[PDB]
Design a protein around this ligand. Sequence first.
Ligand code: GSP
Ligand code: MG
Lengths: 341, 841
Amino acid sequence: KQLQKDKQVYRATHRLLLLGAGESGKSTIVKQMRILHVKATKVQDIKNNLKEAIETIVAAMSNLVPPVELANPENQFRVDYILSVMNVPDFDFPPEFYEHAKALWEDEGVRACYERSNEYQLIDCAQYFLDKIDVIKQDDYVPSDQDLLRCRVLTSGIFETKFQVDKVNFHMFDVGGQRDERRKWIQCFNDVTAIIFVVASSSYNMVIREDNQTNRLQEALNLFKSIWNNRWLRTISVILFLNKQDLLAEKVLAGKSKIEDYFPEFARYTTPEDATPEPGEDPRVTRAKYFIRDEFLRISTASGDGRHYCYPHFTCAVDTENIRRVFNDCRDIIQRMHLRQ
Amino acid sequence: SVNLEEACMERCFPQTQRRFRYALFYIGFACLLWSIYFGVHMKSKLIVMVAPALCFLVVCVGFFLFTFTKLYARHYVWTSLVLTLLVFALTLAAQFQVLTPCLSQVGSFSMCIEVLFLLYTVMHLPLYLSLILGVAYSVLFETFGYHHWELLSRALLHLCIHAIGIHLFIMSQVRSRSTFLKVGQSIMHGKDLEVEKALKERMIHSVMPRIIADDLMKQGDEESENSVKIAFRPFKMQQIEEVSILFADIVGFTKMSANKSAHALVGLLNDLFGRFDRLCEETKCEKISTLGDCYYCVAGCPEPRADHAYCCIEMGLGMIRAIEQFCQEKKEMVNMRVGVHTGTVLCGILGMRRFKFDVWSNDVNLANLMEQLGVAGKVHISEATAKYLDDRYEMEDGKVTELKTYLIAGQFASATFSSLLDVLLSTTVFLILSITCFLRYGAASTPPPPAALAVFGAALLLEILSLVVSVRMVFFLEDVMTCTKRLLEWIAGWLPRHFIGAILVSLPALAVYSHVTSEFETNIHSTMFTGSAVLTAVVQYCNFCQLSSWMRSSLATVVGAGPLLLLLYVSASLIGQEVILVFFLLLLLVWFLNREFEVSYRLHYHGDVEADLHRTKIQSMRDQADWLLRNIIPYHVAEQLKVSQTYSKNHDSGGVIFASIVNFSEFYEENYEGGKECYRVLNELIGDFDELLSKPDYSSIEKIKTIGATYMAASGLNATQCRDGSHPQEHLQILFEFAKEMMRVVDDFNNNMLWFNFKLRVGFNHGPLTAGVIGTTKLLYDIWGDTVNIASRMDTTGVECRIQVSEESYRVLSKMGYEFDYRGTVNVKGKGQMKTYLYPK
Ligand SMILES: Nc1nc2c(ncn2[C@@H]2O[C@H](COP(=O)(O)OP(=O)(O)OP(O)(O)=S)[C@@H](O)[C@H]2O)c(=O)[nH]1
Ligand SMILES: [Mg+2]
């Protein structure tokens, strides 16, 4: 009959739907899983990420409301060259543009505009890739694995990835998370094992690209409230990653932005007693990250009725070892979750 | 009745015949053992005994020959009556020649017990006749045994043997009646369940194709069997490629249906769609459904067919031919235009009331538009058909008048009540055995021995407590406190039932053994008396038929014979030989008899269980097929269609709504696995609309069908009676409330939808309409009329999330206090410009 075996191996797999708002790191987690458990256009859209970043900073120089001007005002012709190529379909990336990008990234009005990047939309791999394109000005270098993890390519539409860890099958659904893509999520809600909700933790001080007037983390909170209370997910537990730990750590240790400026309940927040921080850690960062964790756990607590759970972990997706540890822990968790039926 | 209870004994005959054969053999065996007794042991001085024994043995083998005749099968009661009169007379004539001081009372009384048992249990005579033969035999046996205390003692012994006789008699024949009755029930239910299975099959095939129906009749998924009786509702879709979709529309249906009396119209339309069904079953194209003046097929959606394009345009040309024949024949000026498109199609079932196999894709919408862009008489095909059509047809350029599109033209008996009755009889014979054993004392005014009265009182109180337990268990007084009785009822299972049955069987022989401690073998009246009474008590161990056979029979052998092997040696000389013979024949009788009665009880329980299984199974199949019949047609049409052949009706006032989800097309997107997940979402919405139909205040609202995304429902049809507590046009009010509440249902649905919203517009109209049924061996309830087409116009000219109402429905709705605002003035095909209204303000 042949459908009983296929039906039971369909029972045997684990459906790991990845939800989460814009640029929270879903596709990076899927790339990390295929590094763990499994060819030329990657160079091209790495260079696209470069050009996108440098033109965003160059436009945002004059497009800050106090205009951060050039500390070295000799590069105005270079600034005009970067603004010239801002909207073009194709670009062959000549060595002139590499020298223009390097000469811009050495300037300090440029970097002083870069430090105010919570006031305008900028991609989360600029600081790494300005230095790395200064390394890969040439074209005969194959990008490293971290270079593959840092390349930001937008996701639109349901993607899949089947991989197998130690004779257990995992089938996970990378989805885009922009506000226009959210109608496509409910296609994936049939017989899903677990939901790995992914939150950009360091983007507490930024706003979303759609309306530019809503906090990214507040958007992620309302999105979590929506998918938690959804009438087709009321028996399905939600693993909750919280991505970009290191960016959160350095944005707290820079001390320029305060969480209570944006979430004013943070000022009267105390770190919990069961807080188990990592070694070598400023505990104000620990207070920050447990504040954000308990912001989500309020939502996961205020309903649920013992039907479905929430298992918050702390994670940095561009570091492979962290993903190894948290996915071993989640592997045990969703084993227990699939054995619930 | 009479022929019922005669057919009873017609099918209860062969066990009566077998019993009668065993009684013949047993009487012959008794004559044999008494022959060798009186030929070896005693009475070897006179041959007056043994020659009647041998002659009656050969008379019994004569009767065993007579059983095999065919002039016995209606003569069995009279043959048994002749046999039992011969045995009565022979036992009296073999008793008659005693009391010379040579033969005891304990032998003749065993013959009395044996013959009363064979009369009551096996001879199968009527109750009055066997009872008067029994009492007459007993009194003639005591008056021929005589040739102020012992005589009435023997009369007490005959009293209790007639008690156990009538008890075994009535319970054996009430069981033989009731097992016959249960097998009659279980043989009616087999035929009636075959009927209901045929009706369920006919209603499955009228809504689904052959492949999927024959899938559904071998019950491949058990969960559907559980559900017809947690996150998503179940739905069945299969995204199937390379089908070929055909629509077809009757041109000029309005003037063709001009002044018909709404019975002619259904009849001619029955004829036309029957011709089309004949075309479908010829051409091997699955039809899908039929809506209004429109008919539509597919080409091998459940089955991968290789000439699906060929089958589709051949079916279209067949339609052109069939409608020109109908035009010549019935003299109606109509023809029809056909569109044919190929592509991929996800086909299945959505909704849960009125569900039906349909198809959905964008290829279906393309086939619908190429029908709409078709010219009459010609089949309008696309590039997607023509790219593998092989062009063996009269092809044209199908050009519009206003995308590589072409035209083709041609070429009693309760199981805990019996326990009450036999506990009753066991304790009443324990009673009168105790009475008989006490009144033996004609020498002492007061009873001497202590242990006799001790055991008497002990088992007396035990029997009266078990009697009160049983009699308050049945008669159910609820007097003091029952939770101890409820937990004491629990612990008497099968084996505690065995042990309390052991004691409650045994205790009369304990009461008669209670008088052996005082010496008895000096006198011979006492010895023969206690022998006669102990065989009277061993023959009383039949009554607990709810026990096992070997248990009661072996307890009978033990506590009716073992103490007399003990008292064999206590010296009493040759009466020991005849008493061990006499307990041998009596024990063989009681072994066979309680064997056969517990076999009868076991078969009665078997015939109860199987005839309850068939009753639950036909209740399941009847409920299932009745659900499918109330699915496929309404109720009043099912009433008027059960008593007749076809249905049609003309209603003079009824409302109708359509309800179209506007923006489903911008949710459809096919980029994932065909987009069938998107139709799971749409199934959930149609399922919520169907949950609105189960409300008791939406009883008289009918759902006609769903059409893609559109939802059609109409009222005023079931209300045949103008009520005293209601309004003559209230069904419009409740239908408008149905429209309002399905607006509410989509508002509740969008909360569970994240960053997208469905919007639906509805359109409302009332007026006279035309109900009907199309198929036969298929079924399809549908309405037609001008009210329906103006309602579909109020749908398609609608603004979303607002109810649109026609003019006369405004004029009757606004007299019930609703609010509306004047929308504008809309062209209606047939009505011209029309005054519309809107419900939200
Ligand atoms: N430093 C650091 N950067 C991260 C981490 N996780 C993701 N990023 C960066 O965030 C950016 C977006 O990652 P990406 O996987 O594309 O999000 P996304 O969810 O797929 O974006 P979308 O699908 O919602 S549109 C990438 O530049 C990636 O380098 C992290 O853990 N640490
Ligand atoms: Mg992505």
